């Protein structure tokens, strides 16, 4: 029979029970069945963005036929998976693909209208046999579908429906659309509540329902790449994989095994002893931990085997519902269900007793591990070091930023709300405006914020507004439309954030540009969405937008004295009302103002430069001290409020680095020597003692 | 032959324009992010015409169309938001002359996607000076007439022939903002109950927020970031201590000059 | 027997010690083993510039299988590698690439969930003539294949972001 | 016979790109993909010869043939 030569009975595989039970979806499956039982055009197609279960819709159709929940006109149908990979196979001689295909056509005409044809990737069938002057399946299924003796069922991606089948208009209107909807968050919750037991049959572990609903919430908010419910499925499966490999690993056994091999190497090097006894104790401890590991593995193995027998009992009582055996129903129910449920719960609480070293159930912490590793959103529940680190955010800033406490407190509040998770799900996390004089650590503040969040200085998409002094530069940074040159690339900032989802964006020197470069900024601070040239959105909600300008800096240095903070912000906010548009300054979280530095802070900054200098030269490998009189004279020589801190920086740079590296490569400065940075009469000297 | 309704909203910012449109979408589909939002402030040059309607034959991204005619060929009953349209390059609107004359649209590949079941909404924010100047002691009608003349200064006379009704907004009063604060505290209770903390508030603290976030000149967002700072920062502060036991009634009660939480 | 015609038993080679005792990279090997014991989407890809030894990473995985350092889904499997250029280069006519491709899938189902597949040049498999990804679409989707990728980041962003089933 | 000598015979075949990308056969193979096992079988210490361009066409693109 030529039917099995190229097709696959899905109802065979439904009887196999290998398939996903499909939950929800009364509406589209009723709609598809209505399009199946017509007079002409027995041709539904499934259309929607990928992952949404279009294959599973037809699979759930087959399950409801075998279970018999259909109208009577389908009771007896045969859904078949036609295969392009079967049909294209060896058609190297002329008229070979067409021969196979028309054999299929006439043998389904033999079937007396009791067979439903299923094809995935219907566009592939459209371009299947389309050779240069040949015949495809498109112009061969043109006749058997306008009459519709061939009960086709389609499946496609939305874009490639548009490119591929809508090119061919006749085989476009052979088929009725069914616009498969993006499933909702709560429908996704329900589906995940149904798909749990198949996954636990796979990964030999257990799943907790708050982790399920948290998987739905997190996957819906933070990813933007794939679509529901598929990304939630992948989170769940990936966490279950990590837990299974934690089970068959352990880390204390790793430490004990590295310990016993270290003590074994030490004992063999010594061959006073005591280390035979210590090695025996550590190997006995390792053996006990290993035996506990094996006992946990045996316990979870037996629990999973009896859970698998429970699921086979569920499948068997459904086979008894379809077939209709009498004693099998009450027998399987009243015997197999309650005793296996109670001893499966007994095995579960036995696991909760015996699991000491490892973990067994899927918790939301595991899910958030997978999500944070998977893209980069810092989701997970806080461990102690990171949380108390966040509580001492201000301290860590003043480990690197002395002075300007306002912005420290501001950004500390921002990121505490961020990792707290109280942010607005329609606005980005940080949205700030920095106004201070030239050279007061604003850029280094943001760099330190990046180094807090990321342990990285410039993993931040600094996009300097100084370049952008005419109107085109929006189309530099967001892209250029189709037709023009920069469509093939995509924009800069939009690919920066689509690459790194969780970043810190700087718009430095934001006094320079024309006042309508601030409209992308309006859309960013409106929803956190931005549409680049190609026409898709990019999520900015998990980012931080930062501007550093120097507008009222003259008024800052004029009147930071004899004023409080409130009148300061009021007057300089009016100054921005002179400059920018008021439609913009509503959007900003806090506009902190930067006072000029004081000499104590300048000395502290010099200390910081000495600390990073000692750091870099101890990386070079030098033991360097200082006469603090040199610090005092460098402080006295590099004071100017009108120019900020960087004059001290270049004074340090010149009057330190020049004699230093002047005498390093001379062989005068030997590593390991005490290098006391003493003074000359007007300069600095270093000694080798 | 015309699309369902084509409105030009006006006002100063932060009074609820975008929220009216998102309220429509979250009504009509129960979703804010199921609509069409063309951020028209990008369109400061005359090219993004050829990002929304598509690029003609013989050019780069030809077989993927615009952004507009794609997703309105898809979903024929959407509600477009074109926000901030006053900052477009002032002739991008001629595209919108077709869009609001008949709501067919000559795209790239030629197929006339049809709009006539899709609400065009335009929301500008031209009404700063005029509404802040004379919303007091004036009716709705003369305000509509005078800011209509203002938009006639800005746009083309060709254009506001088309627009169905140009409804014009008003700045907020204090009790309005108190109700706004009620809504914001509802969404805060939403975001924190998902985390799992039963939180109440002093009703006096509502009045303190009314003393806090009020200014007539900036709309409702000053209330929002006042809520942000003067509620969330002590809140997320004390949460991150491990201090707040879940299940306790966390009543946001006033300080002398601030608002504090309880654990009882 | 197209396995004799197109694949290489690397487990045989390292079993005979032919291969590099590859050192390090254990975190990435472990994440690959995580991926290779899922229920669905059972296919890792390897993103890196050529010459960083992604081949050798799969080789060291195979040596660990020879060692038997694996969890309880991989003990007894046979890792076999495959090119696409060995399949594309014999396309005189319509349907000659694809007979080879389906006979490959027949051998894969024939070994009954015991063979782990390797394929490098994933971005090659995008273009052969529809041609290649759609025939592998069911076995990549239904767990009946354990494909392992190897390509470069530029070719990932150029090719593999196009077909979502390829993603 | 190469397996009989085990690297004793050091063959030469020039135009490797020609032997890879032109040996078309009907229901039959080439020398390229039948000796691509001998690449990863060590029984092939063979030498080639080509031009600067066709090496880059038909040789540098494959991994094993690299
Ligand atoms: N409601 C549902 N019931 C059962 N399984 C579902 C449901 N929604 C999604 N799935 C599963 O999620 C996965 C993704 O659905 P698929 O049908 O494979 O995507 P698709 O419909 O094939 O679209 P593409 O383009 O092939 S990704 C499958 O394993 C489905 O079984
Ligand atoms: N409190 C501080 N702690 C540490 N370094 C500081 C502090 N205040 C200023 N600085 C230093 O001041 C230097 C100059 O500040 P920058 O941020 O680099 O310049 P700026 O503040 O951005 O102003 P412009 O417009 O860029 S000149 C930096 O190298 C900082 O290290
Ligand atoms: N009447 C209102 N009801 C509820 N929320 C409001 C109201 N007015 C303002 N808001 C809130 O404050 C934000 C500002 O409203 P928007 O309409 O976005 O600003 P706008 O008035 O549209 O000016 P644009 O669009 O930003 S130029 C909204 O997103 C809501 O969060
Ligand atoms: N962990 C490792 N230990 C030892 N050598 C390694 C390791 N990782 C990679 N290498 C070396 O990297 C070399 C690169 O060879 P290949 O495997 O061909 O390169 P690749 O990284 O696989 O990329 P291509 O596409 O194959 S060139 C190998 O010969 C290895 O010896």
Author numbering:
A (entry chain B): 159 to 407, 409 to 430, 441 to 858
B (entry chain C): 595 to 858
C (entry chain A): 159 to 287, 293 to 330
D (entry chain F): 265 to 330
From the primary publication:
Three-dimensional (3D) classification revealed three states with different conformations at the seam and maps were refined to resolutions of 4–6 Å. These states were termed WT-1, WT-2A, and WT-2B and populated to 15%, 43%, and 20%, respectively. WT-1 and WT-2A are largely similar to states KC-1 and KC-2A of ClpB-K476C, whereas WT-2B is reminiscent of ClpB-K476C state 2B. Although we observe activation and inactivation events (WT-2B: AAA1E activation, AAA2B inactivation) in ClpB-WT, these are not coupled within the same ring but between the rings, indicating differences in ring allostery between ClpB-WT and ClpB-K476C. Thus, inactivation of AAA2B in state WT-2B is not coupled to AAA2F activation as seen in ClpB-K476C (state KC-3) but to activation of AAA1E. Furthermore, subunit activation (AAA1E) in the AAA1 ring and subunit inactivation (AAA2B) in the AAA2 ring occur simultaneously in ClpB-WT rather than offset, as observed for ClpB-K476C. Activation of AAA2F, involving the dramatic rotation of AAA2F (44.5° upon conversion from KC-2 to KC-3), is not seen in ClpB-WT. As a result, the AAA2F pore loop remains at a lower position in WT-2B (11.7 Å upward movement) and does not move to the top of the spiral track as in KC-3 (33.8 Å upward movement). In all three ClpB-WT states all M-domains are fully visible and enclose the AAA1 ring, in agreement with previous findings (Deville et al., 2017). They adopt a horizontal “repressed” conformation, with head-to-tail contacts around the ring.
We studied the disaggregase ClpB, which contains tandem ATPase domains (AAA1, AAA2) and shifts between low and high ATPase and threading activities. ClpB is composed of tandem AAA domains (AAA1, AAA2), an N-terminal domain (NTD), and a coiled-coil regulatory M-domain, which forms a repressive belt surrounding the AAA1 ring (Carroni et al., 2014, Heuck et al., 2016, Oguchi et al., 2012). ClpB activation requires two signals: (1) interaction with the Hsp70 partner chaperone and (2) binding to substrate protein (Lee et al., 2013, Oguchi et al., 2012, Rosenzweig et al., 2013, Seyffer et al., 2012). Each AAA domain extends a flexible pore loop bearing a conserved aromatic residue, in most cases a tyrosine, which interacts with the backbone of the threading polypeptide.
